[PDB]
Structure 1
């Protein structure tokens, strides 16, 4: 039920968090 949907949203949140972290890291790497 809603718990599996919550788990999937958790995974999406974590993936996007790492992606933004590396995005900003490489943005800083030039600036």
Structure 2
């Protein structure tokens, strides 16, 4: 239960990390 909650948290952490990397690449592209 707690372990699978941690797994889901890790999944969303990876998702948002990739999204943030894309966002900052796009930002630095123009700035």
TM-score (norm: length of structure 2): 0.93
RMSD: 0.4
**Structure 1 runs not aligned, ≥5 long:** none
**Structure 2 runs not aligned, ≥5 long:** none
TM-score (norm: length of structure 1): 0.93
Larger fraction in helix: 2
